[PDB]
Amino acid sequence: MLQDLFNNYVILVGILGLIFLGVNYFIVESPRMDENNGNISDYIEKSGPFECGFSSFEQSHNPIPIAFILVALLFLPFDLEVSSMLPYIVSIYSVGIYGLIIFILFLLILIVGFIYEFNTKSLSITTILHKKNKALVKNLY
Amino acid sequence: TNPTAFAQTTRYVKDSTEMRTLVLNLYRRYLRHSRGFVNNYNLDIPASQVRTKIRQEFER
Amino acid sequence: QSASTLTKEDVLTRSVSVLRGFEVKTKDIDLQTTFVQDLGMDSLDLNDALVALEEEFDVVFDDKTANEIKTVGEVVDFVLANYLPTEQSINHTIR
Amino acid sequence: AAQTKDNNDFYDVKTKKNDFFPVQVDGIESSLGKYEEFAKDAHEWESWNLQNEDHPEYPVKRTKIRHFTLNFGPQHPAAHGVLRLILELHGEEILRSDPHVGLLHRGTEKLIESKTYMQALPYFDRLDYVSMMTNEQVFSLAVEKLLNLEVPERGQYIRTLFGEITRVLNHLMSVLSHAMDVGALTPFLWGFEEREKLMEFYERVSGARLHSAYVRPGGVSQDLPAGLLDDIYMWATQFGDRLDETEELLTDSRIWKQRTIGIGEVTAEDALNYGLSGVMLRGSGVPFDIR
Amino acid sequence: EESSESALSKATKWYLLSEIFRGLYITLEMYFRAPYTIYYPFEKGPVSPRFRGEH
Amino acid sequence: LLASGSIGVFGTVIVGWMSNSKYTVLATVRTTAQLISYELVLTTVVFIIALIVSSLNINVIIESQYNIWYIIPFFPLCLIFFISALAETARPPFDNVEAESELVSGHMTELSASPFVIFFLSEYCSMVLMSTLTAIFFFGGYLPFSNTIHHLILNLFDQHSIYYFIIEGILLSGYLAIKANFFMFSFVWIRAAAPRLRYDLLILFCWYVLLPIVFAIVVFAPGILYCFDALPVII
Amino acid sequence: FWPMTFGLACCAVEMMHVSAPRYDQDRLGIIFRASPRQSDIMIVAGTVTNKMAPALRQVYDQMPYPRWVISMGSCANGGGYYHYSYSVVRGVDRIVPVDIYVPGCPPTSEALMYGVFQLQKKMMDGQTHRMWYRSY
Amino acid sequence: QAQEILIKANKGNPTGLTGLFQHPSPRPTLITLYKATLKNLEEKIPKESVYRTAVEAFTKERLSIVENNEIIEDIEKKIGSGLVEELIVQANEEYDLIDKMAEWKAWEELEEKPLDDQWTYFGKKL
Amino acid sequence: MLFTSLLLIIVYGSLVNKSHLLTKLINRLGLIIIIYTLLIHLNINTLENLSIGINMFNNLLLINSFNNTIIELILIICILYVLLISFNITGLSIIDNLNYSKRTFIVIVLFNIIGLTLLPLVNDIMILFIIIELQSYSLYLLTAIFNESHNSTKSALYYFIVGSIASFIILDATVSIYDDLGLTNIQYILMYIDKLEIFDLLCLLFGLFIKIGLAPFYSYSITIYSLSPTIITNYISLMPKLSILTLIYIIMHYINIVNNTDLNYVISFLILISMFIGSFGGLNVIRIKTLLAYSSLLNVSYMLLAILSNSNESIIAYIYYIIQYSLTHINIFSIILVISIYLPIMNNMLNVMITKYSPIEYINQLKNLFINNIFIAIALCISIFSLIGIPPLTGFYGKYLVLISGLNNGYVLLSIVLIIASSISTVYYATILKVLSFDTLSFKDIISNNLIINTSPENNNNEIKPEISNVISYVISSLTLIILLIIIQYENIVKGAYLVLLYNWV
Ligand SMILES: CCCCCCCCCCCCCCCCCC(=O)OC[C@H](COP(=O)(O)OCCN)OC(=O)CCCCCCCCCCCCCCCCC
Ligand SMILES: CCCCCCCCCCCC(=O)OC[C@H](COP(=O)(O)OCC[N+](C)(C)C)OC(=O)CCCCCCCCCCC
Ligand SMILES: CCCCCCCCCCCC(=O)OC[C@H](COP(=O)(O)OCC[N+](C)(C)C)OC(=O)CCCCCCCCCCC
Ligand code: SF4
């Protein structure tokens, strides 16, 4: 297997991406040819953030609560499970029945974690607010 | 329906002495938020000039 | 970590410095110096000083305390009892 | 409410109720001496801290930081025009919503008082600017009732015929744009051709596609041109299929039902108390219709 | 326990996206229909003698 | 193939680099959520096809479909693969990253001129790539629709001349193009026929439904092959 | 020709019917963009109020050059029915430069398309790069 | 005494009105509310009040219907004021109104007379 | 038995409803599982059969008589720990419900027991890395089991980072050995024990020294043990040392084949520093768990002297010391949990805050225990006098056997230092005893109606209601008398230690 052709393609792809930026930088007319409002670094009304018209509080570095953080964390153990199936893909014939049973027992252990997640309802989106109806009771004397 | 932030319930004060306290309490809130007013609206004046402006409007 | 590091003398020393930046009648300020009489502060002048003292010590006088405080010593006592350091991020403490 | 020493506009000191016994600890000592002998130097020693952070009454000054404040402002396709919908978001869940309006406030009611009753009618075409002729009808009825006059029989049928043609026009704009916002783009295009056919009926009797000052106090501006009823009927024989094809993509779609079922539930008790009417009121089980 | 359709029947529709393919088929029908577009300015929409334009 | 595609997700999240734009930030959170949905499902479906051929070579997978196209034995997987392809490309009904009615333009709301083009080009390049992948994994790739027709056309040309191999490349890629154009049509087709699904509903859709189904098949398939003494080898 | 989705009032309804199948603005290459960054045409379709005027100016400034502004309807042109209102701007040209004015209340879908054609005719007559060679 | 009575149930089969659930004990709840309403009128509101006279007239009519009709549909079909779940809400609201009327003392003289020019429009006195 | 029953408990716990009663009954199920595991292990594993050493699972694991003894000890000590969460420790809901709040408590323990038992059995560098992470991860989860506690989550964050660095050092050492030799099986590596860099095994021990809180890495261990709840500190401060020290002895057994004198000096240097910090560190402290953390560091140093010598007497010394220290460790923490019922209730100076996680947090909270409960106070005194080394308690014989191995192998400096460290550490050990009893005669005529136990309602005013539950009191009684009366059966127990062989044979 020779990969010199592949290397040339990867080199071209990297150069190709810079061409799009270089072309756009050399094709656009200069600001003086346009309305001549100066450089973008000074046009603060343009370089500012977009908030649908009305400026609001600047919360760039405020914390962002995530309601699917547990699903994000559970992705990593399951990603490793899928990755660990790669060795069996190309060695299925040589391992024979012995490897097939080992491969099933491997999945029979991870299915316990899959069952545990189902019962614990850990995949559901967490919410701060809860909507509960309150029964109206009269304290008649 | 929950009221917005910093929302007060409208009330008619029948005591002149009580009204004076409410104005003084509101006067301090303006002074405490003077730096916040400068930061949020990106003013060209320091917070000291804002507090002078707030005092002038209250004294009117 | 999250504990007050103030002293009665340091709080009084910085309280005097803040009050000397105004147009007070007397520059001799102690614990028993009254705002209304010794310093000659009216309604709005007193509230300007209280907010200025709030900025120095990063404390907020409540409505009842601010509407009844008479002397500088009461301001010093309030700062000592109520001042707390602002909570830092997780990285500042454990790192 | 009010600035307190434990709660103000800038910070707060929250202390939960204690869930354990108030244990009394006295005479703290080490193997070398009493606590008071080393308490001066103990600030460098974390093992000598007398306050546990797990305690419910542990003092902590936490700055009051506003939630994610997103402006669903005028330059947003979801807003059907101009609306500064301020949302207090905790991630994406909505905690508090502040609809800011008046971006389209043009003082219509103030301007009407300077106009005669005939001059004031075109202002109503521009309030609900998709259901124009119904807006004229409510003002026309009010003036007619004040004038103690009654529209003749043919006039009433015309305002009824175009009252429902107007209702079809409004629901075409309302439902399809509601589906377009959710993500169904195609039904929006199908029904907006039906609007073109119906707006042609608006222009034939009045000369204006949208702002047809046709319904006036005391009847209608002009009589129907010849052939209008035949054209309206020919459209009517076909409009039934357009509704069915619209329902093919929405009514039984599992994606559409997951976006609407259980969303924005309004109880019958609360619908009346908030002055809701029409589909909002009738959706909660109350069969009330002004007609 | 009172469902008219069996669990296998309800699962077959659910797993095979019965109504989704129905919606796709209807959309494909319009692909073989005449569009409504007119070629302005080479063609003009309907007008009436009552139309209001330039004075 | 799978490793290179996962790098493209990192490019989307870069735009939300402590950005002052609130709509850009919200798109990055949604983008990460979608990745958790399809990545496990998409990867495992491709592994089942590789397991059936016992090879991780794309060209070997294409040649293994000479007698049967994998659409017939694995019709559920083709639907699952296409759903994951829609989620990966952030195409509707999974267009939560760039929902115009929700997040104006998503991560591209602050982009203009060349940065917008490159992101626009990359998104549509993924649509072609995923459409081509569907033709490869389940419809035999470049293999002819009819073997008889392929022989007849090539018999009109001499194999001693370069014209045969020019026509041969046109036919083989033409077979791939027709299958790829159908799914590129299907990418447009689903956009014009289905409303957008919420991303939190998508998370529950993949983990509760798609993952159990694909994991069930990854056990079902070796059981069938071992039962009939048909474990795959590379030749 | 990429306008920005900036519908304010009843003039926007006629702007939607340009995208309707009868006229199909997309056949001319016209796509409405939700962000000022991706749009070069600003169509002011509706009434501009004093409460809205600062928002309109900010959105206009956020459009990269080259940019054009279209004033549609009597409200945007000169205030129209609400000219003598206490809260209405008497013409969007008081805030942003206008390249073409489309008359009507509302202008018909063909009236707006004619105005776009006039703007495209003006755009095709631009000589930005020949101006640098001969005028600078 | 402590007669804790359920006014609005928060669970159960729907009634066709959103947010309104079926009441487990329709008839017994109305009987206690009606009887307590009649007793409260005779202890707080004087006899000459028109409000007291009218409430007793219809509360007794609704109490008689509830105590003579076992079928829930027949109760609603004769009272004609909505479902029984709605009648329980109406009984609670009427019971609380009597307590507010007693505090208001709304049977006395007009607390505030209007001005001479108050209800005059464009020169004509209404 | 462990693996199969763990899966059943995992599924069952997630199915039944969430309640304190079901969790406690599930904890008792875990107690039966460990008891069944002990019975099965004792049925098939014997000291005589395992003397030679038997390979298992393609030689990835190797079990001998030395390894088998620790596994039996691990199971037994785990049984005594589960009794704390499987039964009442104080009888008060406000205190005891903490143990029943987390359902995964018993699950995480069973995960760690599998790691603890298999760690001394590792015979490959690959499985060594796998098992050491299996044990380490289970300890992080147990430290963070109370996720509503600020200190518990902070400690687990500290525990994770320090252990991960130690795991990297362990992985770095094993990889460096593979680079030199190309082999992963330990027995194959022993063929080249004279041709590989023996200091790479010292890098391996450095990672293991971190995980047991050895100096200079002591600081994190003291901080974690003090912040963690007493029920959690009781486990994480003892169980990791049961398995890692046994593995260190095996590794040092292989290292002594080449007898690198430079290797011994470096380990001697760390032992010397650990005795200094272990003794002087606890002199000025006010927390009881902080005091025990320094006590744990000092005692591990004593065992490391036996491990470093690595002779026939070292096997006798290490096996005896680890068994008796574990029993003393359980006894002390069992008493600490119980005596929380005698804490006075406020009804203030120093603004002392005590949480439900650690009701006993300061040494002076043990005041007047001689009056409050004379039998419990003496039981604590016997345990403390054992840590001091007063004969004929179990602690004296542990130090007596350690000194024999140290002086026989020529560690004169360490033997003298360990005895000076023992005298220095006696100061803070005696402070516990001073708090318990030295004010008995002045506070005998005192009234205490404000204690925690006084809040417990009576049944009928005629039932003789014991202040302590049956199980925890019996365990304290049994362990105290075993420590006290070891002289009765000391000769036979050492004879059992004579038969524990690590490839000695003849
Ligand atoms: C006849 C019976 C005899 C029984 C006792 C036998 C041993 C006697 C020991 C004599 C030495 C200790 C007595 C004198 C020390 C007095 C300490 C002192 O005065 O202050 C501490 C000193 C700093 O001085 P400062 O704190 O400023 O006090 C004011 C002085 N004008 O701090 C210092 O500078 C001290 C030096 C720094 C610390 C050095 C520690 C290194 C190790 C020291 C040996 C420990 C060995 C422990 C072995 C087991 C543990 C490994
Ligand atoms: C062959 C591969 C391509 C097609 C794969 C998917 C086909 C549908 C699978 C589920 C069918 C099902 O569940 O069938 C059941 C349903 C509904 O019938 P029902 O409610 O039970 O009818 C009631 C009882 N009757 C039968 C007595 C009246 O049928 C369908 O909606 C069929 C959809 C047909 C239109 C779309 C077909 C072409 C799709 C677009 C081109 C790719
Ligand atoms: C063994 C055979 C395996 C079959 C493999 C294929 C399975 C497909 C998924 C079935 C389950 C499902 O679509 O579920 C629907 C889910 C979750 O719905 P839910 O919240 O559970 O509510 C429904 C359950 N009810 C009724 C009990 C409450 O959301 C959706 O609407 C996902 C819509 C995805 C549409 C993508 C279509 C793109 C075009 C594809 C055609 C070219
Ligand atoms: S000009 Fe006329 S149609 Fe346009 S927004 Fe104003 S009132 Fe509406």
UniProtKB/TrEMBL annotation, chain D:
MF terms (GO), sorted A to Z: NAD binding; oxidoreductase activity, acting on NAD(P)H; quinone binding
GO cellular component, one term: mitochondrion
UniProt EC number: 1.6.5.3
A biological process from GO: mitochondrial electron transport, NADH to ubiquinone
Catalytic class of the enzyme: oxidoreductase
Record keywords: NAD, Oxidoreductase, Translocase, Transport, Ubiquinone
Source domain of life: Eukaryota
Extent of the signal sequence: none
Family: Belongs to the complex I 49 kDa subunit family.
Protein name (database record): NUCM (49 kDa) subunit of mitochondrial NADH:ubiquinone oxidoreductase (Complex I)
Originating species: Komagataella pastoris
Part of the full-length chain shown: 32 to 322 of 482
Automatic annotation (TrEMBL), chain F:
Topology versus the membrane: Multi-pass membrane protein
Domain of life: Eukaryota
Family from the record: Belongs to the complex I subunit 1 family.
Organism encoding this protein: Komagataella pastoris
Location (main, coarse): membrane
Catalytic activity: a ubiquinone + NADH + 5 H(+)(in) = a ubiquinol + NAD(+) + 4 H(+)(out)
Keyword field: Membrane, Mitochondrion, NAD, Oxidoreductase, Transmembrane, Transmembrane helix, Ubiquinone
Protein name, entry field: NADH-ubiquinone oxidoreductase chain 1
Membrane in keyword set: yes
Gene Ontology CC: mitochondrial inner membrane
Membrane-crossing segments per the record: 1-19, 40-62, 68-87, 116-142, 162-189, 201-225
Subcellular location: Membrane; Mitochondrion inner membrane
Presence of the UniProt keyword tRNA processing in the record: no
Enzyme Commission identifier(s): 7.1.1.2
Name of the gene encoding the protein in the UniProt record: nu1M
GO biological process: one example: aerobic respiration
Portion of the full sequence shown: 119 to 353 of 353
GO MF term list: NADH dehydrogenase (ubiquinone) activity; NADH dehydrogenase activity
TrEMBL record, chain G:
Ranges where the NADH:ubiquinone oxidoreductase-like 20kDa subunit domain occurs: 10-118
Keywords: 4Fe-4S, Iron, Iron-sulfur, Metal-binding, NAD, Oxidoreductase, Ubiquinone
An example Gene Ontology molecular-function term: NADH dehydrogenase (ubiquinone) activity
GO process terms (BP): aerobic respiration; electron transport coupled proton transport; mitochondrial respiratory chain complex I assembly
Domain of life of the source: Eukaryota
The enzyme's E.C. designation: 1.6.5.3
Transmembrane segments: none
Keyword 4Fe-4S: yes
GO CC, alphabetical: mitochondrion; respiratory chain complex I
Annotated family: Belongs to the complex I 20 kDa subunit family.
Protein name in the entry: BA75_00622T0
Gene name linked to the record: nukm
Portion held of the full protein: 69 to 204 of 204
UniProtKB/TrEMBL annotation, chain H:
Entry-linked InterPro entries: NDUFA5
Membrane topology: Peripheral membrane protein
UniProt keyword annotations, A-Z: Electron transport, Membrane, Mitochondrion, Mitochondrion inner membrane, Oxidoreductase, Respiratory chain, Transport, Ubiquinone
Pfam families linked: ETC_C1_NDUFA5
A Gene Ontology cellular-component term: mitochondrial inner membrane
GO molecular function per UniProt: oxidoreductase activity
Membership in a protein family: Belongs to the complex I NDUFA5 subunit family.
Protein name, as recorded: NUFM (B13) subunit of mitochondrial NADH:ubiquinone oxidoreductase (Complex I)
